[PDB]
Amino acid sequence: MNIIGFSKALFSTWIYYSPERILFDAGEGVSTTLGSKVYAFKYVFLTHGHVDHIAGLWGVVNIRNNGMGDREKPLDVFYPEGNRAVEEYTEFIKRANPDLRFSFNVHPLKEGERVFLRNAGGFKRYVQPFRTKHVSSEVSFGYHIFEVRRKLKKEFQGLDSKEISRLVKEKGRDFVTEEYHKKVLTISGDSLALDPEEIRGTELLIHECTFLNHAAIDEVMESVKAAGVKKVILYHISTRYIRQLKSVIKKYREEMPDVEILYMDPRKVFEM
């Protein structure tokens, strides 16, 4: 599964994006739910430091440290620079359990700072944080996963199969293409409807939808519509608004046939 996660507003939120071995947020229960799968984690990106987005980190590091043996690898954990709650909790984990001190590295990130990923299939993707409006208290980030790609220059897009192949054979691939950065994944974290520009072009939007501050579903769909996003996952949903949102979802699925709309049910583990 490309994505396995769980999200219930105020209680716990965590999203495992398997393709890049990245865990976004770490609410309680992630290690219990994923088991030995936590050994496969290479990165943790935290949107912020509220307990429902970080309390599961201790279990992740504890299980990795006890179950990987001499083949354990340090877990890189990234969070919004200046977020004291993340720093206090990670310091407590290391202080309270010396055996875990070197099991993970905590890296504060500045907005816009890129982190290139190390996985199989090529060196071509990086994670990039953007500031979000949430508690107005501490710093929160949303994240994009970008993929460095190459596409044919406009002038060569009309050539047929044989013509483009002939040209590439003669002049090389780079000559007929230009590089561009595709947003392959966007996670909002807790925040108000993202600016249509922040989400435009993303192949998969994962946006909080706490209400029927945070964001209400209508403001989110409006944003998706303006940015022309085709695939969105709604999360950070509360249990009191289950059916109400569920109904508005089908309503939206009809009103927006070209857009795939999924949601993480606050009562069950999500998989895609």
Using CB under 8 A as the binding rule, whether residue 83 contacts a second copy is answered as no
Give the nearer residue to a second copy in terms of CB position, either 176 or 237: 237
Q: Is 148 exposed, middle or buried (0-12, 13-18, 19+ CB in 10 A)?
A: middle
| Least separation in angstroms between CB 28 and a second copy | 4
Q: Does 95 bind a second copy (CB under 8 A)?
A: yes
Which of 212, 209, 204 shows the shortest CA–CA distance to 190?
A: 209
In terms of Cβ atoms closer than 10 Å to its own Cβ (0-12, 13-18, 19+), residue 16 is buried
**Closest CB 217 distance from a second copy, rounded Å:** 21
Rounded CA separation 108/119 (Å): 22
- Inter-residue contact 266 to 27 (CB < 8 Å): no
Q: Residue 18: which of a second copy, Zn ion, none does it interact with, CB under 5 to 8 A by kind?
A: none
Residue 190's binding partner out of a second copy, Zn ion, none, with CB under 5 to 8 Å set by partner kind: Zn ion
Q: Is 92 in the site for a second copy (CB under 8 A)?
A: yes
CA proximity to 227, closest of 144, 164, 153: 144
Q: Could you tell me which stretch among 62-70, 105-113, 161-169, 173-181 binds a second copy (CB under 8 A)?
A: 62-70
In a 13 Å sphere around the CA of 244, the CA atoms on its Cβ side amount to 12
Q: Which residues are annotated as a binding site for Zn(2+)?
A: 48, 50, 52-53, 134, 190, 236
Contacted by 208, from a second copy, Zn ion, none: CB < 5 to 8 Å by type: none
- Rounded to whole angstroms, the Cα distance separating 91 from 258 reads 46
Q: Which of 20, 25, 52, 190 binds a second copy (CB under 8 A)?
A: 52
CA quadruple 37, 54, 64, 103: dihedral sign: positive
CA atoms within 13 A on the CB side of 2: 4
SS3 assignment, position 258: coil
13 or 202, CB closer to Zn ion? 13
The residue (of 64 and 144) whose beta carbon lies closer to a second copy is 64
For residues 151 to 190, the per-residue mask of contacts with Zn ion, x marking binding by CB under 5 A and - elsewhere, is: ---------------------------------------x
Of 256, 130, 263, 149, the residue nearest 197 (C-alpha) = 130
Site string for Zn ion, 34-73 (x = CB under 5 A): ----------------x-----------------------
Residue among 55, 145, 217, 248 that touches a second copy (CB under 8 A): 55
Classify strands 22-24 and 12-17 as parallel, antiparallel or unpaired.
antiparallel
Q: Which residues bind a second copy (CB under 8 A)?
A: 8, 10-12, 27-29, 31-32, 35-36, 51-52, 55-56, 58-59, 62-63, 66, 85, 88-89, 92, 95-97, 239
